[PDB]
Amino acid sequence: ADSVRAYLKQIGKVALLNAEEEVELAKRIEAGLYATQKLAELAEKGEKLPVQQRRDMQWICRDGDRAKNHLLEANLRLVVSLAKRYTGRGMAFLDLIQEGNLGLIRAVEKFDYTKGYKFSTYATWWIRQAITRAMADQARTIRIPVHMVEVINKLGRIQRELLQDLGREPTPEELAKEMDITPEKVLEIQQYAREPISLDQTIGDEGDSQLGDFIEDSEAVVAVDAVSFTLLQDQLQSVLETLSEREAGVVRLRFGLTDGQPRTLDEIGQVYGVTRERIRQIESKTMSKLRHPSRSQVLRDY
Amino acid sequence: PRQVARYRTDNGEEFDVPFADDAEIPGTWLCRNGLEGTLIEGDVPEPKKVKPPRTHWDMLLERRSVEELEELLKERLDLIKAKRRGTG
Amino acid sequence: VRERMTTQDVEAITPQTLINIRPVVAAIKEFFGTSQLSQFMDQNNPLSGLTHKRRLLALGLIGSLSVYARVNPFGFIETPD
Amino acid sequence: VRIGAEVRDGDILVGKVTPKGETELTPEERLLRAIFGEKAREVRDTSLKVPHGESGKVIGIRVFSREDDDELPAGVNELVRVYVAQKRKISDGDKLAGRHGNKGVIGKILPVEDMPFLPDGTPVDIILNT
DNA sequence: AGCACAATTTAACACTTTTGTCAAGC
DNA sequence: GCTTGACAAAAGTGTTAAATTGTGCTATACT
Numbered sequence: 026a027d028s029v030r031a032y033l034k035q036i037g038k039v040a041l042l043n044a045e046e047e048v049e050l051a052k053r054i055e056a057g058l059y060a061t062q063k064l065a066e067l068a069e070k071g072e073k074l075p076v077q078q079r080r081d082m083q084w085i086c087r088d089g090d091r092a093k094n095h096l097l098e099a100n101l102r103l104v105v106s107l108a109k110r111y112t113g114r115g116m117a118f119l120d121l122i123q124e125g126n127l128g129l130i131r132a133v134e135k136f137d138y139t140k141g142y143k144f145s146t147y148a149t150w151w152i153r154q155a156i157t158r159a160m161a162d163q164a165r166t167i168r169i170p171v172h173m174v175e176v177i178n179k180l181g182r183i184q185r186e187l188l189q190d191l192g193r194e195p196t197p198e199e200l201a202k203e204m205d206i207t208p209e210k211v212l213e214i215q216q217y218a219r220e221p222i223s224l225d226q227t228i229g230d231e232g233d234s235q236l237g238d239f240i241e242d243s244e245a246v247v248a249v250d251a252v253s254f255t256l257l258q259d260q261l262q263s264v265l266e267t268l269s270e271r272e273a274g275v276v277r278l279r280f281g282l283t284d285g286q287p288r289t290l291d292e293i294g295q296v297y298g299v300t301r302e303r304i305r306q307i308e309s310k311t312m313s314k315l316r317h318p319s320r321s322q323v324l325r326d327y
Numbered sequence: 328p329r330q331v332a333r334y335r336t337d338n339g340e341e342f343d344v345p346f347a348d349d350a351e352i353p354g355t356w357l358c359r360n361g362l363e364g365t366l367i368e369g370d371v372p373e374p375k376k377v378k379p380p381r382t383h384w385d386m387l388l389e390r391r392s393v394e395e396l397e398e399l400l401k402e403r404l405d406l407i408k409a410k411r412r413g414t415g
Numbered sequence: 416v417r418e419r420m421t422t423q424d425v426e427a428i429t430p431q432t433l434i435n436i437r438p439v440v441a442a443i444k445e446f447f448g449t450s451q452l453s454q455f456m457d458q459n460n461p462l463s464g465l466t467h468k469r470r471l472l473a474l475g476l477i478g479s480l481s482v483y484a485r486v487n488p489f490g491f492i493e494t495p496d
Numbered sequence: 497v498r499i500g501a502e503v504r505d506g507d508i509l510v511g512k513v514t515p516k517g518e519t520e521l522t523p524e525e526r527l528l529r530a531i532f533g534e535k536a537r538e539v540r541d542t543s544l545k546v547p548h549g550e551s552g553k554v555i556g557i558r559v560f561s562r563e564d565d566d567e568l569p570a571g572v573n574e575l576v577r578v579y580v581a582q583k584r585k586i587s588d589g590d591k592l593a594g595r596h597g598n599k600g601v602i603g604k605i606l607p608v609e610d611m612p613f614l615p616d617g618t619p620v621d622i623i624l625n626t
Numbered sequence: 627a628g629c630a631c632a633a634t635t636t637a638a639c640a641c642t643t644t645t646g647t648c649a650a651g652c
Numbered sequence: 653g654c655t656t657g658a659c660a661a662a663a664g665t666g667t668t669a670a671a672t673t674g675t676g677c678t679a680t681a682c683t
């Protein structure tokens with residue numbers, strides 16, 4: 026009932042290709058590819074071909090893909106063979122296999138039969154690179170770009186080789202020196218390399234209460250404040266009733282109590298039809314009036 | 328204070344996206360459908376220089392010159408023409 | 416090591432390159448922590464800490480050792496010769 | 497907090513602050529800011545306070561700073577630990593027990609005067625039920 | 627792994643328009 | 653009560669350099 030033991034049961038059905046076959050299939054793929062492009066190019070060129078030859082090239086295309094799929098299906102074992110070695114690193118086996126199959130696909134598209142090298146020679150590169158590149162892109166819950174995954178792993182080896190040389194874990198300076206970067210950089214790198222923990226994990230230790238329900242929502246409304254805030258609004262409203270009508274309007278608009286949007290002096294003056302400087306002069310007199318003890322003592326506590 | 332713009336996806340579904348009035352509306356919008364939609368207004372200016380993805384033909388072409396391909400096709404065609412009546 | 420010494424050309428292999436001691440240290444650090452046998456020393460009085468040591472465990476499950484009990488070289492309890 | 501200080505519940509042990517922004521403070525908040533002239537600071541208060549229901553004196557402090565020495569893990573720039581201790585008088589509610597398995601809560605504490613006392617005038621310490 | 631190269635984001639900076647302020651005055 | 657101009661800080665805005673990021677690729681043979 027296992028999923029992988031089925032895939033292995035099917036790919037083994039195909040027979041591996043000898044050295045001579047790889048070349049033959051490779052020929053058919055290139056011939057079909059050009060023949061298909063040749064036809065499409067003629068329509069642009071407003072040209073025609075022998076009706077009989079045109080039907081021949083049309084069949085060439087059909088034959089090229091059969092070789093293309095047959096070439097893939099024969100080398101699937103190679104993808105699995107390389108995929109075995111990268112398990113447990115945070116990617117499921119099947120995922121590694123499929124990504125490897127993607128590399129295999131490009132190996133076929135870029136293979137060159139004229140160079141006379143066995144296919145598995147040039148396919149291993151693309152298959153290997155496909156799997157690793159995939160891990161850097163997917164293995165981490167918080168995706169880290171490839172270049173950063175690259176440096177993190179280098180910092181790991183530098184730390185491992187330095188670990189075995191010094192009989193102790195080297196500090197940021199040595200790690201920085203050996204790596205030719207600033208220690209503050211290696212610190213920023215070591216923060217990036219952290220992987221998250223599971224909230225669903227149970228940390229009850231006698232009590233079976235998961236980690237999740239232990240986080241304090243900091244944005245949740247504070248009960249006392251939303252009330253004292255409504256009481257501050259009321260206290261301010263009454264304090265403004267002492268000011269002049271024009272006066273209260275300016276202070277409101279300047280801070281945006283009524284419309285929630287602060288206003289530049291120019292904007293305030295445009296609604297009252299006065300210069301922007303006068304608006305500044307008004308605020309000053311009314312800040313000193315609001316600084317008068319009668320209106321303020323109440324507000325200091327708030 | 329908001330102006331409403333409509334976008335049409337490829338499948339024909341239309342979406343209303345409320346924007347603020349004092350800003351410039353886009354011509355395409357990532358919609359609730361998950362598909363790009365085009366505004367039904369006048370512009371709709373540009374496609375933003377979409378570039379063609381690399382294809383198998385591009386990879387083949389840059390290793391084989393078109394003459395090498397023509398000969399390989401001649402090999403294949405002469406092979407085909409062998410079974411048309413030719414040899415038996 | 417087997418995977419390391421098999422994956423290469425040869426004669427470049429050295430013992431250090433062949434062996435990353437990460438699994439050794441990890442197993443030991445991973446044993447003292449997150450293990451049922453290793454426990455924080457219970458100490459609110461000298462007796463508590465003394466009896467935390469000498470306590471025996473099974474995978475009835477929990478018990479402490481006898482006063483004159485003296486374990487034998489392998490770990491067979493010997494009672495007083 | 498300075499050594500030898502007395503700390504009640506909610507008092508400050510170590511004063512710490514972390515960045516904060518964008519603030520986007522409420523208008524009613526800023527109007528008071530201008531009236532009283534207290535500039536809205538750019539950082540939020542994250543300071544250690546003694547837990548609710550705890551009290552005692554400060555025995556010692558252990559400060560670890562990145563500036564000089566001090567291998568503190570990646571990211572940490574300074575650490576300070578506060579040690580608080582308290583004399584705990586035996587209080588009604590605490591648990592006592594003998595070596596035979598008998599245990600119970602201290603139900604009451606009677607003044608030495610109104611205590612059953614021997615003919616010496618020697619008051620008894622505790623009274624155990626039969 | 628490691629590098630090359632292109633594509634895109636981010637910084638940097640100049641330079642321009644705003645927005646707040648002053649002194650002096652209608 | 654209010655406006656003017658000089659003026660400097662501040663916030664936008666466009667232009668460039670730097671950095672970050674993403675993709676392609678590596679040819680003994682190896683299933």
